[PDB]
Amino acid sequence: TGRQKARGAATRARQKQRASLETMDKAVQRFRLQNPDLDSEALLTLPLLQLVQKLQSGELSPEAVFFTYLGKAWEVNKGTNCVTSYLTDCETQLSQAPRQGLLYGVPVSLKECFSYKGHDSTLGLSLNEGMPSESDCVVVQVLKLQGAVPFVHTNVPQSMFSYDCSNPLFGQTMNPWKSSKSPGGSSGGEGALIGSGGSPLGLGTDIGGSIRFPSAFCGICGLKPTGNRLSKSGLKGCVYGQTAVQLSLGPMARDVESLALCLKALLCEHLFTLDPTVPPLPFREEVYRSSRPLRVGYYETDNYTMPSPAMRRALIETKQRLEAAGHTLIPFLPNNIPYALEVLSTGGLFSDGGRSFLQNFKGDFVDPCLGDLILILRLPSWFKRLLSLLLKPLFPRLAAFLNNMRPRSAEKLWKLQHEIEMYRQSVIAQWKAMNLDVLLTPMLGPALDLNTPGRATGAVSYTMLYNCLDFPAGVVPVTTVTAEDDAQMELYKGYFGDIWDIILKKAMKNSVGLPVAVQCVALPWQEELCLRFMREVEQLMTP
Amino acid sequence: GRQKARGAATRARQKQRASLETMDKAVQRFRLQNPDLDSEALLTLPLLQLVQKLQSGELSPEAVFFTYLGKAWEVNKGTNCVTSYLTDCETQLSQAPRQGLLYGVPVSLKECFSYKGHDSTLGLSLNEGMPSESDCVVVQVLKLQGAVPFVHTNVPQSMFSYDCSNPLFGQTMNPWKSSKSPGGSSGGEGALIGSGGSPLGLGTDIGGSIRFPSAFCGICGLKPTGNRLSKSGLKGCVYGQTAVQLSLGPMARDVESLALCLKALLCEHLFTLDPTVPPLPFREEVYRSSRPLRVGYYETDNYTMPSPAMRRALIETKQRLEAAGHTLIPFLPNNIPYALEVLSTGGLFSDGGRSFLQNFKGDFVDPCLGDLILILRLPSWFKRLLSLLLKPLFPRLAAFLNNMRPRSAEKLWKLQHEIEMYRQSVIAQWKAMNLDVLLTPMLGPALDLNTPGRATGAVSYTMLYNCLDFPAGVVPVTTVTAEDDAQMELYKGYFGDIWDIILKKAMKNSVGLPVAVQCVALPWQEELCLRFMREVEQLMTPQKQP
Ligand SMILES: *[C@](=O)([C][C][C][C][C][C][C]/[C]=[C]\[C][C][C][C][C][C][C][C])C1=NN=C(C2=[C][C]=[C][C]=N2)O1
């Protein structure tokens, strides 16, 4: 009752998914029958830059690469449920891919919100089912103009406002390293696909960590650029006109060099003419390729989310190896992180009390992976306030969250917007006072159990800071959880001892062997330097 | 209850008085040591040539500085454009980095550009005696490029006006005719540069405030895309409003000066001092291109009826561009009335004017602001009542009153998304016609003093490109003839409401006054916009360049 439309949308969606996967399988079986002697292990394990080179030279055909990757994608989906839709168009695009394109012949996976002609971008929401996109979004257009072959849409958590990966339409995506673990989110399908070898390169989006969480959780690299570095034209969203905390799109891949290639390919005249609102900043190769010693700011904890033992070791070990390689490591923590998270970020994202966002869920199921977010956002402003005052003496983090997700006037939004602006300049001034080039931080990990990211909201602290600040931030895998890391987690307390701390301890249990990352940060518009730094970390920690 | 406002006015005026005297003493001292200097020759050199002679050593920085300072002082007598002498600039003149791209060039500053030790009053008593503690970012960059910022220039009270009077420093007059407005909000720059007292200046623009004074005073100005330059350290009176973005940019006697200024500002100094600005270098080759252009144009926006002079300016410019081999294509951005009445008005007054109005608590309201303060104070329910009453007869006025009401953050999100969609819709329109640039009328000629505040509708030509956030500049192309002026008797406006009636009267008695056109390009295309401005300037006034 009130879910008949919702149930119909799920039924039709699951059938579209089933039919896409069947279509993929038949295409693959057909190719393999014609090409039984093809070494697919050789092809799949090629680093993207090498694959690109052999495609450009003609040593590998676009068909060989496409169908080999398609088969692997179909196979890894069995254990992960990361693919929602096969972009059927892509065999004709495969044979029309511009030949001198920088991504010529390269299969690329897309987060479901990247609009693709003839396909739904459901976001797991019933209201977006049977609403196929009338055209490719700008970044998909540019990928195609650079010779890339977008081949799949990958799963997201319902609404994308989550760092887990389940919705009522396509269901739950699972981490390929351990099926009881979350692949992270909201680009969770991308993390799981790329992380199991089913795609050499993908695109995701990030408003609170959604490129960096699935990258870290699935053992892959990811970059969230400055928000307006790449075009968001034609991206499917669910809140419109919230500009306090901007969304950013960026690459995900198996190595840092893939991120740089993808950025280089996207930052071309095609993109700049298709979307004039994006500043025409070409990829500065000389900055990316530079090898000068760096002043590297670093912290082991943000004093908000206690790092897991694995997180702290990964950070410390990276710091140490950077110092051994000639870099100057400088203790640095951005000022007033509780403010940035509780007031600026929470208030920016929910200035209207959650009302606009909540329109999406009307008549829909609420996926269990979203926790109580929808229930909480729905509370009357006065009750958010009362409950906040009652909780403040015991659980001030919870109290501050509740108080700052209440509706407000446009006058108060201006005030908040100016505070975000002044806070950005404050941290820039702090950074300049220490003469930093870059900043090295912990990254959330290892992967949390399925359906717990929605109950561990405080753990977005490490990522969300750089959305608030709108700094480029990316993640690099540096280590895996040891027996000792995992045993030490038994003693994890957290700084607050509220429900978010309590859950995280349990959610990270049984994590031996799982990948753990560090986060690399630079100033606004310094994507190339941020990537240069990520490259250094990758050279030192996975040589 | 105005004891506080009167005291601020008394103090402000003594500071201005003292600044002007310090200038006079400095100028007389220099002149007695340099009786043979050909100041006229120096003052009439185009900025490019002035810069070359400074860089070569042919002209000394002191000769250029004290000669322009003398002129600024002289021309202030009839204009009241200068509020403050930036006294430390003589030590800056002696420390000017020698290879700076603006080495030795005196630069005038709109009063809102924070300068260490000096107020940025904005004409408001509450900001009087509250001196800035550091130079704003663009002032630091100008100084790192060897430039000598030398004066603060007058603005209308609060800057939310295209006239130029405040209760503290008084009224700035147009140098072409003293009964006329110099425009604004950067009116002091318009008046100072337009009478020869500065080779280069900086202004700001949220609804035309670079372009109005440039057109009214017969000089060139550019309003770039909002975030092309750093707004760090700019004094404003409303903060956090991002729907209709503020922009800053150069004003000068020729287009080439605007290009040099941009080139000097878009350097590593700026990009490192404000990392929030995309580090887009000035693309010389784009500015210098001589390829034919696809030029969209309109002779009227169907909102503000152009003066006979505005319309002749546009048509003559259009015909010379056609004769120079460019393709002139009719083009009008869609839904202008909606862009102005809903998006622009709603964007500037999303909070009903409350944040803005705090600035006037305890202050005199300058007559040049018209009835804006009185109207913004009206209760939201009364604005709504009056809107419904006026709608049948005066739909523009009704729309204005309706869209200046306070709203929720939810409704502001909706408006902000509508601004975004609108920008993409005009972009789609532009690409569908494969335009390079767009030629539009520019409001001219100068309105009588104290009438801009009563002719709000006339911001339509300029305000549209703040809404869209496109680079837009203006170039003087002609002057009002007796024929043009007589034709004002046949001017009715499209609506016949007070705005039309005030504008008709206000644009009369303007023979000999300068009239401009507006030049527009897509976001981040300042170089192409300047390329096009350069082309208009050369075809219409070929002696402003070689
Ligand atoms: C991802 O970046 C989303 C990852 C963040 C998930 C946040 C879930 C918790 C909910 C709110 C947090 C508010 C701040 C908390 C501060 C600390 C406690 C006080 C992503 N990717 N795409 C999108 C997205 C979302 C909505 C529209 C479009 N895209 O989010």
Ligand SMILES: *[C@](=O)([C][C][C][C][C][C][C]/[C]=[C]\[C][C][C][C][C][C][C][C])C1=NN=C(C2=[C][C]=[C][C]=N2)O1
């Ligand atoms: C200048 O750009 C100000 C010039 C514009 C003056 C506007 C005066 C009229 C008031 C409102 C107009 C709203 C839209 C009308 C649409 C047509 C009728 C429906 C300038 N320079 N600086 C600033 C400024 C202002 C505030 C803060 C910072 N800077 O404005």
Ligand SMILES: [Cl-]
């Ligand atoms: Cl920007």
